[PDB]
Design an enzyme around this catalytic site. Structure first.
Site, mmCIF file in Angstrom:
data_model
loop_
_atom_site.group_PDB
_atom_site.id
_atom_site.type_symbol
_atom_site.label_atom_id
_atom_site.label_comp_id
_atom_site.label_asym_id
_atom_site.label_seq_id
_atom_site.Cartn_x
_atom_site.Cartn_y
_atom_site.Cartn_z
ATOM 1 N N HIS A 114 12.303 -17.998 15.268
ATOM 2 C CA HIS A 114 12.892 -17.010 16.021
ATOM 3 C C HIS A 114 11.844 -16.128 16.437
ATOM 4 C CE1 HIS A 114 16.889 -15.480 17.552
ATOM 5 N NE2 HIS A 114 16.610 -14.379 17.008
ATOM 6 N N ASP B 111 13.637 -22.353 14.494
ATOM 7 C CA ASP B 111 14.381 -21.287 14.579
ATOM 8 C C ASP B 111 15.673 -21.143 13.881
ATOM 9 O OD1 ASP B 111 15.826 -18.829 15.067
ATOM 10 O OD2 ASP B 111 15.765 -18.862 17.055
#
Lengths: 233, 233
Positions: free
Chosen positions: A202, A171
């Site tokens: 993410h 992420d």
């Protein structure tokens, strides 16, 4: 889409709506769900519906009601995605915590409530989850890929109720150096758990996102369910 | 549920716990909350959290401490409801007034207090609210569906502070003869108000009751807040 007729009043008198679902078997523990930057949209109807399927009631408050009540944006549309980010620029985090507090109090005393309340947040709502956990409003808190957790590490000693956080190893909306800081900072308080999902980016729990990873989503979700189970009667 | 580390000593050296909440803006007026027959349970918590979110501090004493400290009974459970009635039977009303006085006196000087103290009571606590009002401990008192108010009419003259009462008109605890006597006796003292809610029976402000009545709950609660507001700074 919000549930017709549902109104929740914050400490400062501001009122907002919510999407609500509850299982037919009551009483049940209630989970307040803290949105992403996209408002109470399809992923929020998905999340409400999943938690109902798993024997929880759910309340997803309209945290954008101070800015643009009823906002529901499709993260896969460019212009709508850009508007989400602008709404985030102006989002008042302290007022969001206050609105979540109001939604949590609401959740406690509905006819279907068993009196226990958890919170589950995503992205923006994941950061809000950590702030709520430090305040101690809920029995249990979960955040998925919260943003800017490394800026809140001073509140670690305030957390006095169980809280669980799921973070993507891939992420890149988390600065690489943040990982150790969060891991080590959280590691000081055994009520706080943080899991890393080394293949996930993410928004890895949301199918509409390109960071989606099914196996990581399923593992994070199993952990969430296992962590929330004690709230059940 | 009670608040850890809160211990209040009463007139005879007996000590009891309490559930306490304070609002974000201290100091505030404090309301002492007199329980129903189920101990300091989920509805007491609801009431503490409600008044706090309205700008009050709130203290709900464990009035069952002399008989079974930390009692908290689910009204929707048969065996727990049966035990509640047995506790109610043995409840010493005068001692309960003394314990409430102790709580009120304690509430006067806390860091969160503005020095003004009110009382709101339900069911059992609604009768205690009348008795406390007759002692003159508090600045203002409120009782919801107090039981056996008709037995207390000789104290009507003694009430020297404002007191408000919300009564169901179909309350099987207040059969018709009693309603009229109460309406009559309270009529004698301009400091006493009583409202009657014709649709409603016992417990009409508690969402867990089969007798819950949203509209009467709303009306009585709004009246309660108006009546308490003068305590605020």
């Amino acid at each position: 889409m919000l549930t017709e007729g549902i109104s929740i009043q914050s400490y400062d008198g501001h009122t907002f709506g919510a999407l609500v679902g509850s299982p037919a078997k009551a009483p049940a523990p209630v989970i307040v769900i803290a949105q992403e930057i996209f408002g109470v949209n399809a992923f929020m109807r998905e999340t409400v519906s999943w938690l109902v399927d798993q024997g929880y009631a759910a309340v997803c408050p309209d945290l954008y009601a101070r800015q643009a009540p009823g906002t529901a944006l499709d993260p896969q549309d460019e212009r709508q995605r850009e508007q989400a980010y602008k709404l985030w620029q102006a989002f008042d985090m302290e007022a969001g915590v206050g609105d979540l507090e109001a939604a949590i109090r609401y959740a406690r005393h509905q006819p279907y409530s068993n009196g226990k309340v958890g919170l589950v947040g995503y992205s923006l709502g994941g950061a809000l989850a950590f702030l709520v956990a430090a305040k101690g409003y809920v029995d249990r808190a979960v955040g998925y890929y919260g943003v800017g957790l490394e800026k809140q590490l001073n509140k670690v000693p305030e957390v006095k109720h169980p809280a669980l956080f799921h973070m993507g190893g891939q992420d890149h909306f988390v600065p690489a150096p943040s990982r150790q800081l969060i891991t080590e900072g959280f590691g000081a308080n055994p009520l706080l758990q943080v899991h890393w999902y080394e293949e996930a980016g993410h928004s890895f729990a949301r199918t509409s996102s390109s960071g989606y990873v099914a196996s990581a989503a399923a593992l994070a979700n199993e952990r969430t369910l296992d962590f929330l189970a004690p709230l059940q009667s």
